[PDB]
Amino acid sequence: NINFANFNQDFSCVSVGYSNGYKIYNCEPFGQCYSKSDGSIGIVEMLFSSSLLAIVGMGEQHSLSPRRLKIINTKRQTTICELTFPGAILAVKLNRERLVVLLEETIYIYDINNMRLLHTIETPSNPNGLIALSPSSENNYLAYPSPNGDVIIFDAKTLQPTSVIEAHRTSLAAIALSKDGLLLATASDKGTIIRVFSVATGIKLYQFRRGTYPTKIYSLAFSPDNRFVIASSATETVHIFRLGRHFASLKVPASKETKTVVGVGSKIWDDLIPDLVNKKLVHIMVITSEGFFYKFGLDPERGGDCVLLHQQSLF
């Protein structure tokens, strides 16, 4: 049984948490590149393509717990550190300088090279575990909700609040940061409107109408060049909004209300698609809660309905 899946910071790998261990997958080309038998893994987060993994257990076990974080080395097959907490760990986020741990009403920031607690934030209840951490060390921003749908921008370098963005009038359902930390994508629990902000200034740059009827937005993601922001919801249609809407879309081949996380590759590929043609395509990958891995090809020039390139699975 599959418990957890997520991309790494540059969307070149996928870390998966199972009831009997955890695995690492490459995306291009897709294939298992690491596996480890263990207890039920509830969370397993990567640090790009390094051998550093952040691991939290699902359910109380002997050496695993939903209240405990283990930092390990896959190469040396060693545990580097272990942290305990007074509550369930909702989310763990990482960059090459900071490690962030999310609990329902508290946020813990660590210097990732010595694992020393740097700052602690008392927050309003964050049950959905919404948080985002910039993969950029040059602009190390931290984003979390603070109920309406306000977003606090916290400098993870200087350990200081920066700005307060009034994203939505209602509670946030989804949040994302660009690879450079410069852009912020948000979505409320209404899910009709997708907003894009500039972190440093607080200016709402774009605003895309997802649809007319409300829905649950699961996942927002930027392309690495910040050309596109994509969104997946309960309707299983994934929108691709061009930053410069209706540019493109695709249909996740799954039943309604199937939870997904989306991600965009960093390279453009010369794929051979149908009597045959080659097309320079942006790869958009979709992970479903049932463990399916769908790779769609996005034409970054004409857009339109993205073609399915490959179906892969985990468990």
Curated annotation (Swiss-Prot):
UniProt-listed Gene3D superfamilies: YVTN repeat-like/Quinoprotein amine dehydrogenase
Q: Which regions are annotated as WD repeats?
A: 167-207, 212-244
Task: Fetch the InterPro entries from UniProt.
Answer: PROPPIN, WD40/YVTN_repeat-like_dom_sf, WD40_repeat_dom_sf, WD40_rpt
Q: Where is this motif: L/FRRG motif?
A: 208-212
UniProt-recorded name of the protein: Autophagy-related protein 18
Purpose: The PI(3,5)P2 regulatory complex regulates both the synthesis and turnover of phosphatidylinositol 3,5-bisphosphate (PtdIns(3,5)P2). Necessary for proper vacuole morphology. Plays an important role in osmotically-induced vacuole fragmentation. Required for cytoplasm to vacuole transport (Cvt) vesicle formation, pexophagy and starvation-induced autophagy. Involved in correct ATG9 trafficking to the pre-autophagosomal structure. Might also be involved in premeiotic DNA replication.
One BP annotation, GO = protein transport
Protein family (similarity comment): Belongs to the WD repeat PROPPIN family.
Keyword DNA-binding part of the UniProt annotation: no
Q: Does the entry feature the keyword Transit peptide, yes or no?
A: no
* Primary residence: membrane
Q: Cite the source lineage.
A: Eukaryota, Fungi, Dikarya, Ascomycota, Saccharomycotina
Q: How does it sit in the membrane?
A: Peripheral membrane protein
Q: Which Pfam families match?
A: PROPPIN (PF21032)
Looking at the UniProt entry, the stretches that span the membrane are none
Annotated GO CC locations: endosome membrane; phagophore assembly site membrane; vacuolar membrane
Where can this protein be found?
Answer: Preautophagosomal structure membrane; Vacuole membrane; Endosome membrane
